[PDB]
Design a protein around this ligand. Structure first.
Ligand code: HEM
Ligand code: HEM
Ligand SMILES: CCCCCCCCCCCCCCCCCCCC(=O)O
Ligand SMILES: CCCCCCCCCCCCCCCCCCCC(=O)O
Lengths: 428, 428
């Protein structure tokens, strides 16, 4: 056939202005029904947007799609860092992706679970004594302590908020989807400050001056050698060591979304309390329902055909992350928050894709998915059952046209109080 | 018969100089074998020292023994505070003892267990970053945070060590067993500072200005009324509210003893790791084996006879706490540290008496025994299995002739490192 087209020499600024609704706005407008359409952006480039489970499966087929060299360069410069694993391909990628996955052991993840639970439990008194708590800001300080500890890197108390704020600026910086913007240079400065500190950690580890525990990211990254037997240079080593816990800190976006989901859906709170499996499904439904990753780029590796369309080598592609996750043919009632839908989920690698799809070892899928689910499950259990609080009057708006997805207020709470059954006697 | 006697117009200074060994030194010397002997102290007063399970049972018989008015008045002034529950008798005592026991709910004790576990888990990084850690000092700061939280009283971070040090001075002050001493006035000042702060907590609770959680000591004590319908005056209320968590902080003495027991007995460490029930028995054996309470005073309520001796009304008595617990006819091999001995223990109220014997509700037995066992069990599990450390060269001496029992160094440790199995994969 002939791919339907959003016309224009370059629709980059229209894509940015419409945000997470851009792709579905065009599909509805043009009546496309096989989840393929075309547009132009990033300086007049032809871009084919894929959606749906079959779109996702095609996008993660290493015979059809090539990933390297498709990320806009200002996004690399602020989100991932130059030379980062996201920018690698072929043998080099599978080699280094193996390093990242070797941190995802059952024992390291259980450590991560305990760190998250104890940091929340210990943060209760501090939250009780504040007048108001911005969950999005509070999460990000808490997660910075958890993630620095989990990675084996040193962050004394007086650096924590510095590091948090710098983390917050880097995660936010994908909003320009390749453009320079107000904050581009502030984001590069935050990246460099943190990169410097992690490169120094690496160099002190290699020189025997500090001793991170075996099995932590800092230890393993410092002492790793690639398949040619070479270690990563100290600067690239710090860059990829940061890709180990900057995204961890970014879970604060989902935590704010989860607190809002519980507020908009009071039944979900009582049910998180009563059942750990609902807490898991609640966290999965937060990652499906709320906006974070809009789409991801790649390009055609060699010519192929798909649903009757011809795909030409080096034509730019994009997998629609948000749109696939709100496609009614993929998720019934896609704009209702309904965690129980995961009772019926078959665990496909191609429909729950908020952090990528495909295969962790041979695709570019998020290495931290399991870590993300563990942290969200712990945090939501905490908020549902360990504390009670008031949600004051505030702007809880989530503007789907603005990247990135945020609760406008950051979700404020007040009158936090720990939940302790002190009159439970053994007669009860 | 005729009670054997340590002769002297007054042997107070000899009792003090010999410490936890005084009673057994005299029994061996005089060949007593029914655990009764006599001496003079506290200004020429006749004192009959009882020991053994039958000594303990007699001492806690409310028909034979009267407790009120027997504690030396400088000990009341520094340890317990004037008007304290320890100084009450009859209906007034059973009434107020019921208040204290109503805090010992299964739900409040599980709260206490969680507080202890999470505070230790969170303290690991701080200990890892110190060069050396004095376990006795570190415990006492940690326990101050736990006990203030558990009691529902406010202690901001910058008061914690102030409060700790003041707690430490008050617990230490029973060493003069009635005498004025170097530090008497320093101990009264620490008592008054803490009493003032707790009386203010009480008054702000009654006036509705602060809102402690229902079921905490602060809430229950503030709002309690006695059997005549009267609440405690605010100053006495603070005094007895302090008897709710100053002794909790005093568990730091046992914690230091427990760390030393693990060091002197390496097998006990591996066994605490492998089994929660050994951890319980280890904590019980620390309370039996190491010196803390030497003996407690009372007096004869009405005339009676016991093992052939005549007991005259108002004759002063003392139950030998340390000596009963190291009597070979009560504990086989009483000076070997052997936790497994509690496999054979029948739970008698009269032989494991490191915090009193008899009945919690109608005797003056420690209201915080269960709390003490919970804290010791959690703390010993932590030290045995969550961290590893070095024990440097130091004076680990426990001078049994000096009240109170201390590890001379406070038990120093270094090179603390959390224990995390990060290479545990699900194949293992
Ligand atoms: C919690 C700890 C996390 C870790 C350790 C982590 C780590 C990583 C790494 C190393 C990659 C690159 C892997 C590769 O190139 O093969 C990646 C990719 C990615 N991550 Fe994460 N991440 C975490 C959390 C998150 C969060 C909260 C999000 C939010 C949406 C996220 C979204 C993504 C996306 C969209 C990709 C790209 C997938 C693709 O290119 O196909 N990650 N992550
Ligand atoms: C952990 C929290 C603790 C609490 C809440 C607590 C509380 C109390 C209270 C309220 C009393 C007076 C009860 C009455 O007069 O009827 C008492 C007595 C006593 N406590 Fe504790 N205590 C704790 C820990 C300790 C510790 C570590 C020791 C160390 C040996 C100890 C030793 C004693 C002794 C010897 C008595 C006197 C028993 C008697 O007079 O027959 N307590 N405790
Ligand atoms: C309509 C098609 C437009 C295609 C434009 C290509 C622009 C690519 C945008 C890239 C967005 C990446 C979003 C990743 C945010 C992840 C934050 C934490 C996760 C991590 O750092 O790994
Ligand atoms: C040989 C007979 C001498 C009798 C002398 C009577 C002197 C009485 C000494 C009293 C010692 C009390 C020891 C209590 C220490 C308890 C510390 C924490 C427990 C708490 O505060 O409840």
């Amino acid at each position: 056939a002939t791919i339907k087209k959003d016309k224009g020499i370059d629709n980059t600024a229209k894509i940015a202005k419409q945000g997470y609704l851009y792709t579905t706005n065009q599909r509805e407008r043009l009546g496309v029904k096989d989840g393929v359409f075309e547009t132009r952006g990033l300086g007049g480039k032809r871009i084919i947007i894929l959606s749906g489970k079959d779109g996702a499966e095609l996008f993660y087929d290493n015979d059809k799609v090539e990933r390297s060299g498709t990320l806009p360069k200002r996004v690399v410069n602020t989100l991932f860092g130059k030379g980062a694993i996201h920018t690698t391909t072929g043998k080099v990628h599978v080699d280094r992706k193996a390093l990242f996955m070797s941190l995802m052991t059952e024992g390291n993840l259980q450590y991560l679970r305990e760190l998250t639970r104890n940091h929340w439990l210990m943060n209760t008194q501090r939250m009780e004594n504040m007048d108001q708590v911005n969950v999005y800001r509070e999460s990000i300080i808490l997660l910075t302590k958890v993630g620095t500890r989990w990675a084996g890197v040193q962050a004394p108390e007086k650096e924590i908020e510095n590091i948090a704020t710098d983390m917050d600026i880097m995660i936010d910086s994908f909003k320009a989807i390749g453009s320079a913007f107000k904050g581009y240079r502030a984001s590069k400065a935050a990246r460099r400050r943190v990169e410097d500190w992690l490169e120094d950690q690496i160099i002190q580890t290699r020189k025997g001056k500090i001793h991170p525990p075996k099995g932590t990211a800092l230890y393993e990254f410092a002492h790793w050698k690639d398949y040619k037997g070479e270690p990563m240079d100290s600067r690239l080593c710090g860059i990829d060591l940061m890709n180990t816990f900057r995204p961890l800190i970014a879970i604060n976006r989902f935590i704010a979304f989860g607190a809002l989901a519980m507020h908009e859906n009071p039944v979900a709170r009582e049910k998180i309390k009563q059942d750990d499996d609902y807490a898991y499904m609640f966290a999965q439904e937060v990652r499906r329902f709320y906006p974070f990753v809009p789409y991801l780029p790649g390009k055609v590796k060699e010519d192929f055909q798909y649903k009757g369309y011809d795909f030409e080598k080096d034509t730019m592609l994009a997998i629609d992350i948000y749109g696939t996750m709100h496609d009614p043919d993929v998720w019934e009632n896609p704009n209702e928050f309904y965690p129980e839908r995961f009772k019926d989920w078959d665990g496909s690698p191609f429909d729950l894709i908020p952090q990528g799809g495909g295969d962790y070892y041979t695709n570019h899928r998020c290495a931290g998915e399991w870590m993300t689910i563990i942290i969200m499950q712990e945090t939501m259990k905490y908020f549902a059952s360990r504390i009670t609080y008031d949600v004051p009057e505030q702007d809880l708006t989530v503007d789907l046209n603005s990247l990135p997805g945020y609760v406008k207020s950051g979700f404020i709470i007040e009158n936090v109080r720990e939940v302790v059954d002190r009159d439970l006697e053994h007669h009860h």
